[PDB]
Amino acid sequence: SMSVKKPKRDDSKDLALCSMILTEMETHEDAWPFLLPVNLKLVPGYKKVIKKPMDFSTIREKLSSGQYPNLETFALDVRLVFDNCETFNEDDSDIGRAGHNMRKYFEKKWTDTFK
Numbered sequence: 750s751m752s753v754k755k756p757k758r759d760d761s762k763d764l765a766l767c768s769m770i771l772t773e774m775e776t777h778e779d780a781w782p783f784l785l786p787v788n789l790k791l792v793p794g795y796k797k798v799i800k801k802p803m804d805f806s807t808i809r810e811k812l813s814s815g816q817y818p819n820l821e822t823f824a825l826d827v828r829l830v831f832d833n834c835e836t837f838n839e840d841d842s843d844i845g846r847a848g849h850n851m852r853k854y855f856e857k858k859w860t861d862t863f864k
Contacts, residue, residue, distance in 0.1 A: 763820045768812060770858045774827070775805055777854060779847040783830050799837060803829040820863065827855055 774780060786804045789796045808826050817823045834848035 760820070766862055767817070767820060767823045770855070770862060771805065771809060771812060773858060774851065774855060775809070777851065779850045780805065782834065782844045782847050783851065795837065799833050801829060803833060805830065824859060
């Protein structure tokens, strides 16, 4: 509260470390559904159904331009990529499986790096 602060957790490396994680996600073999924004002209249903599209390229641009205020807003966008994928894709499809795999991969790197 006012003039009463918990000890300062060092956040000075968060930007670099989120960039590293994102590089690892970008280079994973199962990243291909997620690298670029879904083409809303070419994929029926996507525009109306997925209220907040997100993709790795869009997160990389946001990261690079100071549009994440802290590491939690970065994690929220990453998880949005996978939550969107689950909303639109059956579990038993290549893309549906890709998304489960990538989410698992991310969440381990996240825990190992920060928790």
